[PDB]
Amino acid sequence: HHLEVLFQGPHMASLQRKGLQARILTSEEEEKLKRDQTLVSDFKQQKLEQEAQKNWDLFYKRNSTNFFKDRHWTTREFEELRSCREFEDQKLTMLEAGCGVGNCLFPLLEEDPNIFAYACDFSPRAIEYVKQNPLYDTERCKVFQCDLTKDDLLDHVPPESVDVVMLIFVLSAVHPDKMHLVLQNIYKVLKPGKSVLFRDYGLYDHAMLRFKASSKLGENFYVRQDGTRSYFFTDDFLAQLFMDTGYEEVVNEYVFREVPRVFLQSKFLKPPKNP
Ligand SMILES: Nc1ncnc2c1ncn2[C@@H]1O[C@H](CSCC[C@H](N)C(=O)O)[C@@H](O)[C@H]1O
């Protein structure tokens, strides 16, 4: 059960945008949310940015937590991985950028036994989780520490060697002013003609509506109780980031999932090389 729709035309698109917003968001509760979510202090916002890696690492050090997520994958990403593969067992090279404990990595590794995955995260405890997974295998997976906003992926990944990059619930954790750095870093490992598969929180997702006072860092940008952060993307903001860093939009769609979750799921192409 799914229904996919594309609205074209200035008037048609705007009318639908506002209709869907009003069906999730009470239109007067919009003003209420903006007044109630008062802004975190500059001092604390600086600390949260400086401690981005530390707060994720502390999250992964928790006990009493099932970090693993069944059904976290999607049919859409699996189909994208079957595209342009002549043989089911053909070698395919991927990067799972911001891999966490591997909830996207390991399901993808069971798709094609000659998938080779680079995988990186800035949390050392996440990387240890990856390396201790039952499915971990150095002939299938090269995992390494990398802060995507400032460590060059080329230190570990040969240039233009990757057939697909996954960027799944990662970019929303990055400061909006630094998101472009992440995509520029990724650009250099991706083969011309190949894509980033993106999925992340979207505007007016349930989580955004639940955040309270002194959780708001900025428009669409919140800190969670564990100090990690979530930005809630609009389609246009996300497309502009990718266009500004050299990609072409293929797919860029809101996903409504029923509790009304709002995600953005997208596919952005690195252009074929020219003359
Ligand atoms: N600047 C950065 N560089 C590298 N990893 C980052 C990062 N900012 C956030 N992360 C990582 O992004 C992850 C988000 S959780 C999503 C993990 C995985 N892609 C999945 O789909 O399950 C966390 O593991 C966090 O440590």
Numbering used by the authors: -10 to 247, 257 to 273
Task: Quote the paper.
In tRNA, the epigenetic m3C modification at position 32 in the anticodon loop is highly conserved in eukaryotes, which maintains the folding and basepairing functions of the anticodon. A study showed that METTL6 catalyzes the methylation of C32 in several tRNASer isoacceptors. Methylation is most common, and it can be catalyzed by a large family of methyltransferase-like proteins (METTLs) that transfer the methyl group from S-adenosylmethionine (SAM) to a variety of positions in RNA nucleosides. The loss of human METTL6 (hMETTL6) affects the translational process and proteostasis in cells, while in mESCs cells, it leads to defective pluripotency potential.
In this study, we solved the crystal structure of human METTL6 in complex with S-adenosyl-L-homocysteine (SAH) at 1.9 Å and characterized the association mode between the enzyme and the cofactor. The final model ultimately resolved the full-length protein (H-10-P273) except for an internal disordered fragment (T248-C256). The enzyme exhibits a typical Rossmann fold. The helices flanked each side of the central β-sheet formed by seven strands. The SAH ligand fits snuggly in the binding pocket with well-covered density, fixed by the interactions with the enzyme, including hydrogen bonds, salt bridges, and hydrophobic interactions. Specifically, the adenine ring makes multiple hydrogen bonds with the backbone nitrogen of L137, C135, F111, and the terminal carboxyl group of D136, respectively. Additionally, it stacks onto the aromatic ring of F111. The ribose ring also forms three additional hydrogen bonds using its 2′- and 3′- hydroxyl groups, with the side chains of D110 and Y49. Finally, the carboxyl group of SAH accepts a hydrogen bond from H61 while it donates three to G87, I157, and E85, respectively, including some backbone interactions. Lastly, the E85Q mutation reduced the affinity by more than 30-fold, while the D110A mutation almost eliminated the association capacity of the enzyme.
